[PDB]
């Protein structure tokens, strides 16, 4: 079990840790989060009570170091920092706990939801999409644009998602215009899986990361990327059987986790109607189709 201590909580905030959220009041004696399962990635996110503009947070892996949160009253945000002095860190987290001013990561043992949502997400891929090599953890917020979006303006503060564009030379082999536009199998299998991702695990890792950035931060460019990576698989006549069967499980848990009152802003009606009811894989997403029909029928 790992800990993320906080120096203090000077401003009223909603704090998320993975799929859970709690409230902290202004200058409440809060000193962070204990009892965090190791192994995965995690995300710790913030939305200020006094200004719900800019949600932001940090992706991290407790195995890569000792992380803490300290509010910066100049920049006006909770900042993640690494404690390089392990003895000092062990001294704080053995004591603040002995104080009991920390909230417990509340993992139900039947509940494997966070593992299902991050199965393919890896910190090393996250640090390629979010470029800040001096930190072991990666900052994302509501407003960050994607490299693709910047192509249609500060590259340091951008989400370096794999560019997917169905009407680009990369997607369309000269001489195969109709074939490749109607059946994106070439673009999926040769360009994206063989060429760029190298395997379906890295593909799914980016798709899962994009979904979580869309859900946790309301990051629009992340939602576009999530939808694009679903549509590319569904619009291909030729997809390995294992990938379709895994895609059904990935999407089911994402739909299951999505806040009920967030369906208007996080689901693209066009993409979901196409994938579930028109696409080559319309009959390949049984579990996803069933939860969407029963949970979000208004969209379809």
């Amino acid at each position: 079990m790992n800990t993320v201590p906080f120096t203090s909580a000077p401003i009223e905030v909603t704090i998320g840790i993975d799929q859970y959220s709690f409230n902290v009041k202004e200058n409440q004696p809060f000193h962070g989060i204990k009892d965090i399962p190791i192994g995965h990635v995690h995300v710790i996110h913030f939305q200020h009570a006094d200004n719900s503009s800019m949600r932001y947070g940090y992706w991290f892996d407790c195995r890569m170091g000792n992380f803490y949160i300290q509010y910066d009253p100049k920049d006006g945000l909770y900042k993640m920092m690494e404690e390089r002095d392990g003895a000092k860190f062990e001294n704080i987290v053995h004591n603040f706990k002995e104080r009991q001013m920390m909230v417990s990561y509340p993992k139900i043992d039947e509940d494997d939801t966070w593992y299902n949502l991050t199965e393919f997400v890896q910190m090393d891929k996250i640090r390629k999409i979010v470029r800040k090599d001096e930190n072991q953890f990666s900052y994302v917020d509501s407003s960050m644009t994607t490299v693709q979006e910047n192509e249609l303006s500060d590259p340091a503060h951008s989400l370096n998602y794999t560019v997917i564009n169905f009407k680009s030379r990369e997607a369309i082999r000269p001489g195969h215009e109709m074939e490749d536009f109607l059946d994106k199998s070439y673009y999926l299998n040769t360009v994206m899986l063989q060429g760029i991702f190298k395997n379906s695990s890295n593909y799914f890792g980016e798709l899962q990361f994009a979904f979580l950035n869309a859900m946790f931060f309301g990051n629009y460019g992340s939602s576009l990327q999530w939808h694009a990576m679903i549509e590319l698989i569904c619009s291909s006549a030729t997809v390995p059987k294992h990938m379709l069967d895994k895609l059904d499980e990935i999407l089911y848990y994402q739909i299951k986790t999505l806040p009920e009152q967030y369906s208007d802003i996080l689901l693209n009606e066009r993409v979901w109607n196409i994938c579930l009811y028109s696409s080559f894989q319309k009959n390949s997403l049984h579990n996803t189709e069933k939860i969407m029909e029963n949970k979000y029928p208004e969209l379809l």
């Binding site: 009407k167 680009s168 215009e177």
Partner: protein, 237 residues
């Protein structure tokens, strides 16, 4: 974006633009079979690609052989159109390449954008103009060359004949659209108006009769009358 009537002039500025109409690319007759079923037979079609400033018409004849053994022909027709328009643009010197292609049917947008990926500075746009280019096959000389074709074939015309010697490109386009709208609304009566005087002829190298300026005023009047008459008949007004 989608062309209309505020910017109706922009059409006739110095930026080269082409209208693409695909309504006559895939054409069929619908007839009864021996089993008492109904069967289509394809007949030759054409892509109508027009420079509205110059009158230059690139008529790509679509021979029925293109459909042989193909499925979903109405879908294929949009992609065939896009292929041939792209090929036409590639065949032109850079200084003659259009800066805009305006498709008369929004269904042409994705096929044309995909075939034109090599030309990222050529804007592919729909229009809010309801243009009567479907009636191109009512022009006898265009219909004759399409129906006689035994192979794929590109034929060049000036759809304004010599009008630009005497009127603006705006005025010539307005005359063309009136004539085509009349031929679309009542083809036989529109042809009667044009061919009523056997003393006014069509030059070997023209599509339309050699009307004087005054005769064109009278012809345009008779075409407006034909359209209004047909409106009254359809809506009992």
């Amino acid at each position: 974006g989608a062309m209309n009537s505020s910017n109706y002039a922009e059409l006739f500025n110095n930026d080269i633009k082409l209208f693409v109409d695909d309504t006559n690319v895939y054409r069929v007759t619908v007839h009864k079979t021996f089993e008492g079923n109904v069967a289509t037979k394809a007949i030759n079609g054409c892509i109508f690609t027009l420079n509205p400033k110059t009158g230059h018409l690139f008529l790509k004849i679509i021979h029925t052989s293109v459909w042989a053994g193909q499925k979903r022909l109405s879908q294929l027709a949009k992609w065939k159109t896009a292929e041939e328009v792209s090929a036409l643009v590639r065949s032109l010197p850079k200084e003659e390449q259009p800066k805009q292609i305006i498709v008369t049917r929004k269904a042409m947008l994705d096929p044309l954008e995909v075939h034109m990926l090599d030309f990222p500075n050529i804007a592919i746009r729909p229009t809010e103009l309801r243009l009567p280019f479907s009636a191109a096959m009512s022009i006898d000389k265009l219909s004759d060359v399409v129906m006689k074709a035994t192979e794929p074939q590109m034929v060049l015309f000036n759809i304004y004949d010599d009008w630009l010697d005497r009127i603006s490109s705006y005025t010539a386009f307005s005359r063309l659209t009136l004539l085509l709208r009349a031929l679309k609304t009542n083809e036989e009566s529109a042809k009667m108006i044009l061919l009523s005087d056997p003393t006014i002829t069509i030059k070997s190298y023209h599509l339309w009769p050699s009307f004087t300026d005054e005769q064109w005023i009278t012809i345009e009047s008779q075409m407006r009358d034909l359209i209004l008459t047909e409106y009254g008949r359809k809506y009992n007004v």
